[PDB]
Symmetry: C3
Subunit: 160 residues, 3 copies
């Protein structure tokens, strides 16, 4: 069994007027937000896919499909907790996590420590090993036109 396992997640959602903008569990006010079947939490979904992928498990759509055992309107916290449980039972913990959010507007930096603490609380990890940064998309393509929001996560898992 491997002492370290590397994961990558990506997620993108459409932003449309009058919808919720929820990032890592945190509500951020804005003229646009995520139009999705989920709660639209691009950061939470791609952290989940990074964990699942580091471990070689089925992906977020395979584990939590559109069709009930118990999902459909689950808060993204539900998917984060199930992913850390499966990680734990596989014999791994979080070494560190680095997420990049791509978002034209609004500014994420004022909410950053609030996001990091909530994401850390849900992962059961120390905030000193869970990181998030943000970037605009320079007014080009859908992301730049604020017609979408994307997140990348790279994660390094450690054998317990």
């Amino acid at each position: 069994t491997l002492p370290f396992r590397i994961g990558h997640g990506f997620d993108l959602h459409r932003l449309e007027p009058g919808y919720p903008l929820i990032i890592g569990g945190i509500v951020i006010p804005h003229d646009r937000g995520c139009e999705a079947h989920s709660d639209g939490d691009v950061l939470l979904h791609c952290v989940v896919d990074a964990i699942l992928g580091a471990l070689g498990l089925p992906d977020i759509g395979q584990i939590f499909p559109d069709s009930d055992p118990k999902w459909k309107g689950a808060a993204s916290s539900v998917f984060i907790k199930e992913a850390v449980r499966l990680m734990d039972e596989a014999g791994y913990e979080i070494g560190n996590l680095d997420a990049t959010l791509i978002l034209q507007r609004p500014k994420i930096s004022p909410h950053k420590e609030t996001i990091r603490s909530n994401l850390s609380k849900l992962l059961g990890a120390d905030p000193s090993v869970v990181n998030l940064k943000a970037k605009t998309h320079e007014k080009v393509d859908s992301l730049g036109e604020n017609r979408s929001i994307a997140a990348h996560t790279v994660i390094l898992l450690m054998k317990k």
Copy 2:
């Protein structure tokens, strides 16, 4: 010499009507496929670039250029096998691999284990350390309009 080496690959191809859609060696039927000089295998090309990049070698275009030693119409398997040979001679093996495919349509999940087994066979690695997930692009930009397909790979290499 370093016990671990990290790599990242990215590739994107145009999708046009009536072309082959080949992903990780596997044929997937679809109204569009890759218009390319390669066989268009976005997953295979970006795994190759992740390996090459983890090792600090020239990239896929530098190692396998348009101009014969022996390439031009090589199946992407040829590039995967040459990359694992160069990795081996550098003194490394695969720790784990996590690839993300971005594709609006069709659905990749039914073909997933078939893709993973073929990619594992070509890498000479166990399927339990080679992972692939897929994501739509929410109907935005070329990827969302099914006018292209992209792949990211993060890889962690281990010293033998």
Copy 3:
């Protein structure tokens, strides 16, 4: 404290006619270049964000904001040197770095070793652990239309 720390950076800039194209400190002639408040160095900025992110520090905009202590027209070298200082004081060094540049035109490969040596010089790392590759964007979206340039970096940091 963790023996290894993983980082990811992303950056994108607009390309417009008659501007400088500077990549990893190196001038590359071209009919378009980066229109930015920075020197526009997408590779240098995203290496900085990968380092900062691996360490869990504030991001490039938070550490080097628009408002003087001493920035505003700093060459991107200034940000690279401050990032390696903060890495050093945190007790880390570079294990390896793999950057991917996405650029339709011009061709980066002829300048590649020049870029790698300059980036290595600024990081205080050996060129054998600092890697860069390049990719087109297949004539689609802003990147494909040469209306922008993007860079991804994955980095693995080692405890001293």
